[PDB]
UniProtKB/Swiss-Prot annotation:
Residues the UniProt record annotates as site (Interaction with coactivator FXXLF and FXXFY motifs): E223
Phenotype upon changing N88T: In PAIS; 50% reduction in transactivation
Miscellaneous note of the record: In the absence of ligand, steroid hormone receptors are thought to be weakly associated with nuclear components; hormone binding greatly increases receptor affinity. The hormone-receptor complex appears to recognize discrete DNA sequences upstream of transcriptional start sites.
Domain NR LBD: 1-225
Record's protein name: Androgen receptor
Gene encoding the protein: AR
Organism for this UniProt entry: Homo sapiens (Human)
Outcome of substituting G235E: In prostate cancer
Effect upon mutating G80S: In prostate cancer
Length: 245
């Protein structure tokens, strides 16, 4: 099982947010900390993606683009997973030093988004998702959002995505019905996209007004959110869904 060996080997470790838990919870502090966490995790997601089987088959411009479009969904999905394994989805485990209870969900003014994310975390429990399933699903999320007009070399992308789908199917097949399970997992993967879209909308709006509300955006975050995220929100870049929405 070369493929699973690899996904397991490359899986990023713990990333902390740098949040000061001594200071009262305020919108500005929580969101600055989440933004900082995003920047730190972005560094890990890039090194992760670059080490994925076949990823170097993509054109270099496409390597960068798939990361830039998919990071939100990937980070939300992994955060769901950590919340499940650490808090049993009772709280959102963004980082060891940044765990949201209901009060912080309220204070972050992202309560409805946090509800959807906690629901995804709950699905990990409800569907009894295995770590191997999680790892393959996560890899497939990197290949789940692309420009409507296609990438630089779409053929390389299509083939890579195909290979990852096949890998998910094998993992299900190697389990003690297959069809139900595949249906369940593709439905779960689809459910990440609407959550990612609401956070895309939220973060874009926040960047625009960030001076006003004293929320800090680090450099990579500000740039992707103003350059790449608007492509998604304007419909130039769209998620690939398994099932019809
Ligand atoms: C991806 C992050 C940070 C990484 C993580 O664990 C999930 C989480 C989901 C909400 C995001 C946050 C990064 C910063 C964002 C985008 C804020 O600007 C508003 C929503 C935040
Ligand atoms: Li705090």
């Amino acid at each position: 099982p070369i493929f699973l060996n690899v996904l397991e080997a490359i899986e990023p470790g713990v990333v902390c947010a740098g949040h000061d838990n001594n200071q009262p919870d305020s919108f500005a502090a929580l969101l600055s900390s989440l933004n900082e966490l995003g920047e730190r995790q972005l560094v890990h997601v890039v090194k992760w993606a670059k080490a994925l089987p076949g990823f170097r088959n993509l054109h270099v411009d496409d390597q960068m683009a798939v990361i830039q479009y998919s990071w939100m969904g990937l980070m939300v999905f992994a955060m769901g997973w950590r919340s499940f394994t650490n808090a049993n989805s009772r709280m959102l485990y963004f980082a060891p030093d940044l765990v949201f209870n209901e009060y912080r969900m309220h204070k972050s003014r992202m309560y409805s988004q946090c509800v959807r994310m906690r629901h995804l975390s709950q699905e990990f429990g409800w569907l009894q998702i295995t770590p191997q399933e999680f790892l393959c699903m996560k890899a497939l999320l990197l290949f789940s959002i692309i420009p409507v007009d296609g990438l630089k070399n779409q053929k390389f992308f299509d083939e890579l995505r195909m290979n990852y789908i096949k890998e998910l199917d094998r993992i299900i097949a190697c389990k003690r019905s297959c069809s139900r399970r595949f249906y369940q997992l593709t439905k779960l993967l689809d459910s990440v996209q609407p959550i990612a879209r609401e956070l895309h909308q939220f973060t874009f709006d926040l960047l625009i007004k960030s001076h006003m509300v004293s929320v800090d955006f680090p450099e990579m975050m500000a740039e992707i959110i103003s350059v790449q995220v608007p492509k998604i929100l304007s419909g130039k870049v769209k998620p690939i869904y398994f099932h019809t929405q």
